[PDB]
Amino acid sequence: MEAAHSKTTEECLAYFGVSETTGLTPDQVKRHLEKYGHNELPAEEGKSLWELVLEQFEDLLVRILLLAACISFVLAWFEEGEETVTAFVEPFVILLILIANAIVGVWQERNAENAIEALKEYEPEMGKVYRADRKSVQRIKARDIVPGDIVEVAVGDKVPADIRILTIKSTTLRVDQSILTGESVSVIKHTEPVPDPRAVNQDKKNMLFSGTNIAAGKAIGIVATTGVGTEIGKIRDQMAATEQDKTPLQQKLDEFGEQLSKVISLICVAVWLINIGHFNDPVHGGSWIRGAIYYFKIAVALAVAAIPEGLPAVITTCLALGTRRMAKKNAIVRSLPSVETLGCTSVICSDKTGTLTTNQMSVCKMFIIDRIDGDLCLLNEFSVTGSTYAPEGEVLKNDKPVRSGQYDGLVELATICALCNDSSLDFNETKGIYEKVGEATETALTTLVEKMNVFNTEVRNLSKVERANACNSVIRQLMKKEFTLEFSRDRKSMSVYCSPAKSRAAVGNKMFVKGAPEGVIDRCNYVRVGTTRVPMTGPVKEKILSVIKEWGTGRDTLRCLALATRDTPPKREEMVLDDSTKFMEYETDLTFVGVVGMLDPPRKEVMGSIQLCRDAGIRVIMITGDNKGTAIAICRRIGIFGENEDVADRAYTGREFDDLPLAEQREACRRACCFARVEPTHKSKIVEYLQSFDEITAMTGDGVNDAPALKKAEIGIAMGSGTAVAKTASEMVLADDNFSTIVAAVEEGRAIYNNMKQFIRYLISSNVGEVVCIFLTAALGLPEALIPVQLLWVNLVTDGLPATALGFNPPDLDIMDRPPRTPKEPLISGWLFFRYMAIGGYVGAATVGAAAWWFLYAEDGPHVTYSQLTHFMKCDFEGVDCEVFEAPQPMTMALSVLVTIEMCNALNSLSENQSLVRMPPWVNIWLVGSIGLSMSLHFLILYVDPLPMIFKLQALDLYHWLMVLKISLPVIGLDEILKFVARNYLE
Ligand SMILES: Nc1ncnc2c1ncn2[C@@H]1O[C@H](COP(=O)(O)OP(=O)(O)CP(=O)(O)O)[C@@H](O)[C@H]1O
Ligand SMILES: [Ca+2]
């Protein structure tokens, strides 16, 4: 880790004593490693403070409860009398429910963070280095690179460690450093140094920082420093950590929380004033104050009982739960809002190569010209065996094993593939498998060149390592690659300028081009036949294109490329290299050589996932830069279209899409499910259109040309084996490239919603009748139904654990067989309000009808024969009874029925509109236990003598209880009825 960039190329190569072309010797590596250590970080310590997490105490509400707990603590203190045992209890009953949800949050929160870390501890980062033990680049675990050895980076790659740029192989090099500095834009770089020693990161345009991605280009440089010395390792924790705020569903719910904070605020202040007549009253110390005060409590307590203190805590929990379950499916959630959003995704756009397919390419069919005679064009089509990148396979013609070098046309075909290629193979001894280094497509051609071996290079006895690139190196050792005109989506082809070694064909300089067949074929005026050349003709050009199409729409839906070569390139001088736009011109007046057909197998889980998406109401769109024929073919075989379904206007190409007027483009986007040969920004535009219909859309990519779209989309989904550039722009990464998970994600995203909607229904319909209880008893002639503590109780027993458990609710019956939720759909439909009201009604008038019941019809206390003796003012009002109006017997019956009916109401929230018969309590084994935990806690307060006085008098076991269930249970049938109205009816 030499402390500088200041010095130039030579000083760093010399500082570590290494050749840029060979790189460290296995010995040096041993040394530098012991000396400098493993290039990693202690970072493996991220684990939020034991308590840092216990911050379930910050949401809007809850603070309310904490406040109410304060005023309860001050009142309970001063308040004199035979109290204290009931005065000081109130506060704990208010924060005990907070403590309860607090835990559940912290717990399901730890497990989440805990699983997200294991997802990363699986699949270590890799880097490409140049070591002396191998002639060609080799990939090693990044933790194993050390300062000094040569390293190679390129488009999409994530910079493995701080590096002094020694040389830029491409005609330009840009990179994304925003993560470190801030500068949101491809920043340029160059070889020379900059005098300023301890200068600011943002200036060193001769470095690459560990953690930044390469925007465009390819460069080789020497590791200036690793480990913590990294200008990203020291500036590690210092980052203020930009953890975005709440998610769209939380902002939606936190707002709906204060919407009640208001309504409730009224209910309470109101319930308060609608007293007074009892302020100066007897029962209240006889004073107006004690009377007013007692009622501020009836309000305060009523609030703390109506404010869903478990709402914020639940969204949180449920979310971390989604994350944890995605992690389990090897899916990395990089953004909290993902799952919830996929849940209501109307359309899923997806890249083809890599995303929809395995990207495991191999050349299986290839052809050159055999002979030409008039309108008849004979092609020499060969077949190749070997589906991996292994340099083991044979070239067959008429199914007989041929000597590829026998055909001059195949020699050139091989020459072109080897020289016009920025990739290579690397033998991974650990798995004994040949791996690619660079873009799949190109690598495929490298393995091909190895299989052809047009120069019969003796390779029977070479190391599995030395074999990997043997044949290629030979073609390279025979042609000097002057410069290469980088590949660009505009012209869809790449070129390379080569000079003969020791000048064989004299100054015979050539340009070897390879690209999308159509464009390359169009830029060909000559055809090569053996060593000969002839002008391109109508019958030949059609023949060449016919076989390609045959290959692209068949069983094998091959991916194809044309190989051509400019025999007489422009004078090296008249060519400018800092403007891609000019390159297509340089690649003209070409000579067609041949074509190669690659196998690129669709991922097995795709078709299935595509199907389920249909059922879910998800539209699936394929966007690619590949040939439309190959595209539509692949789309049929994947499930986007039917095997013989006409697609005249549901499949377009870049050109076609652009020829359409703005108005139609948008329509084409809602109609088409396949866009091919799309230009650069087309993927993004296509996501904009779908968003201009107010549709939650998602993009799925693997490479850099997906970044834009991935960011534009509401949800970006990236592939684990894709580039870091796409992964960055993405909000989720399928670590294992399992397309199915996306569907699993959208499902969990929906469940998470329904759950919140159920938690709300319960929490609401209950609490409504809860207050409906007061505004029907405290204003209908009946005596007080409950008192302070008695409210803080039901609260702590029906708004706590049993509700939060609704978060661990299973996915509804046909949740993933119903169309996506409109981005505008209201949180609570109107009928839903009726549903809450009806239930709120009954529960509210079966809690009051249970108090009166006792006084009347009940075989206890008075009997005031159906009339309650009309009023309460009796202090001969019949005077056949004492003051049974201040009896506890009646309240206990009230408090207990409210509680029981609420838990009964809870069982009505396992699903929105589903008969308990189909989805029984045991679908959510947690809700059950929770219920019991609350139920048991009730009995204890009801019968364990020390407690009863603090609350009320023990409702006679049996009879009294039987009466509770006889009026509570109906709530379960009442809503069960409401459900039958929406299920088997309404729709
Ligand atoms: N490295 C390369 N050199 C020469 N030609 C290439 C090339 N990579 C791709 N091509 C050609 O250019 C075409 C367009 O490339 P582009 O990246 O836009 O789409 P693609 O099919 O290569 C990847 P995707 O299907 O995931 O969008 C490719 O289909 C191929 O015909
Ligand atoms: Ca409450």
Ligand SMILES: [Ca+2]
């Ligand atoms: Ca309640």
Ligand SMILES: [K+]
């Ligand atoms: K995005």
Ligand SMILES: [Mg+2]
């Ligand atoms: Mg791709």
